[PDB]
Amino acid sequence: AFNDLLKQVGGVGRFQLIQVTMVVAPLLLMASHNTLQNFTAAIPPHHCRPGGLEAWLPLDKQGQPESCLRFTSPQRVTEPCIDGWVYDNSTFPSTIVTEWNLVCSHRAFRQLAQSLYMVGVLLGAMVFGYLADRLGRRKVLILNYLQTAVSGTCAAYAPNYTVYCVFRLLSGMSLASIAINCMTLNVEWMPIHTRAYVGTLIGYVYSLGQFLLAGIAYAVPHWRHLQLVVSVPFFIAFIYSWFFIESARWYSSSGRLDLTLRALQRVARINGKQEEGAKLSIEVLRTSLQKELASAMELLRCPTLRHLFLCLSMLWFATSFAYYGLVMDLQGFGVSMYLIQVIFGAVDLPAKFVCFLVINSMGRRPAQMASLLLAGICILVNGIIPKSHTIIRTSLAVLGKGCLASSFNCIFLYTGELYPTVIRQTGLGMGSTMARVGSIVSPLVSMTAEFYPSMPLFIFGAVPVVASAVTALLPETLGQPLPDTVQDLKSRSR
Numbered sequence: 001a002f003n004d005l006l007k008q009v010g011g012v013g014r015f016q017l018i019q020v021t022m023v024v025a026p027l028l029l030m031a032s033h034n035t036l037q038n039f040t041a042a043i044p045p046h047h048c049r050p051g052g053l054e055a056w057l058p059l060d061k062q063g064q065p066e067s068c069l070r071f072t073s074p075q076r077v078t079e080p081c082i083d084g085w086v087y088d089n090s091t092f093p094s095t096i097v098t099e100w101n102l103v104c105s106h107r108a109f110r111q112l113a114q115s116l117y118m119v120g121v122l123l124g125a126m127v128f129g130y131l132a133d134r135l136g137r138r139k140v141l142i143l144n145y146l147q148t149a150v151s152g153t154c155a156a157y158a159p160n161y162t163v164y165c166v167f168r169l170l171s172g173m174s175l176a177s178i179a180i181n182c183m184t185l186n187v188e189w190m191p192i193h194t195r196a197y198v199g200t201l202i203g204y205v206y207s208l209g210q211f212l213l214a215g216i217a218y219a220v221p222h223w224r225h226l227q228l229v230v231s232v233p234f235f236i237a238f239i240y241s242w243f244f245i246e247s248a249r250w251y252s253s254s255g256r257l258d259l260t261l262r263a264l265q266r267v268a269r270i271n272g273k274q275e276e277g278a279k280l281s282i283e284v285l286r287t288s289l290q291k292e293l294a295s296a297m298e299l300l301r302c303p304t305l306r307h308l309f310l311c312l313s314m315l316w317f318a319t320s321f322a323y324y325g326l327v328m329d330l331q332g333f334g335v336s337m338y339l340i341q342v343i344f345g346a347v348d349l350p351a352k353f354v355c356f357l358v359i360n361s362m363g364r365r366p367a368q369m370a371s372l373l374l375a376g377i378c379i380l381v382n383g384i385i386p387k388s389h390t391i392i393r394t395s396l397a398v399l400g401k402g403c404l405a406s407s408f409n410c411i412f413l414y415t416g417e418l419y420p421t422v423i424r425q426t427g428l429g430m431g432s433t434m435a436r437v438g439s440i441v442s443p444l445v446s447m448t449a450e451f452y453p454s455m456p457l458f459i460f461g462a463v464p465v466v467a468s469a470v471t472a473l474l475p476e477t478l479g480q481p482l483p484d485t486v487q488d489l490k491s492r493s494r
């Protein structure tokens, strides 16, 4: 086995701490990149460029000047803003909306940019996932840091909308690969009893990145500068990424025992176990890993695994879809986006606390049902309540966000414990893929706000309810042994 060798080198030592810290720092800006559009694509008050200004702008039901209509003659005929729009610079001096007039007839391009970024995220999670099996995790991480820095800066200096969208897609690809491969590298470089802690640290760093986004966006309001400042740190990340030590587990699995010994020797030197490291040798590693040394297409051939795959796909998709639909709408609560983003980042700790309590006490199925159902109801009620109730709608949005984060944690644990070990990792990958698909589709649904203002909220709230209903089909895994083969699945089912 490899666990004994990993323990011998020093376990969680200086190298492990330094590597995990320096490989997990980029997840601080992961959230900034995921939800940058809330600030770089903010929609300020606007009206057509012309008895004064009021005499030219037609009025609406609420009495505000019409956003995209203008009187042909002074005051009755209205025309679109052929002369361009007059935006408000008081709070949002410049965003991609004001830069490229992504308003009214072109207001769906704002959502299409996010959809393309998430399509890039999915594409990266697949392509770089395949590549890391060939070039290793360290090379892929270096390339991802370089790509993210380059694409982010290029988007910050994009001269037109298509270039911005292309570079946002590429940066999403690189960031998705970063997220996928950080956990893999750190898990392969850590013992078996610390991988859950690694995942917990990933969650915490994402929660902290949510705070960081609000802080940075408040500091620098202009969108070009904001994108530049949230994108350039990946240059430093790339610079120090050359010093990473590649996972010895991958080296061994790739049939390079000399490289495995060299990596373990270096880890011993850093961890201070040179004397124990010198004991290791090619013959020892071979005699230890001789023992260690199914496909995703059986998830559909065998009905017993097929049912689980389908249900978990629904669950993952619903969680991601509702989550991103809810969190990409911070400007619709009538409260300052900085405060809302701060509260959204803060609400992630009590959410996971309650989630942990519920899973340990009741089980996984009740936890998943409760999380999804409560998020759906919260979003639906948010849709029903009038927009003039800023405080109540903000509170309900925060509650739904916390519920969706709890659902994310619960679904990860449940899909981990549901599949047999023969096809467990494939199932986890497929579930994450469906989550990425949901994140891709959320902006598409949000594009419908142009016609029906509240339809996006209704769909975002309705999908989790159906997913919670679907959760009732899965079995309970609390206080049960982890299955190892499909025969174990049949035994559990009967």
Ligand SMILES: Nc1ccc(C(=O)NCC(=O)O)cc1
Residues within 6 Å of the ligand: 206, 320, 405, 408, 432, 435, 436, 439
């Ligand atoms: N607050 C969170 C948001 C997203 C995720 C996640 O892992 N999504 C899968 C993907 O789309 O890559 C986890 C926590």
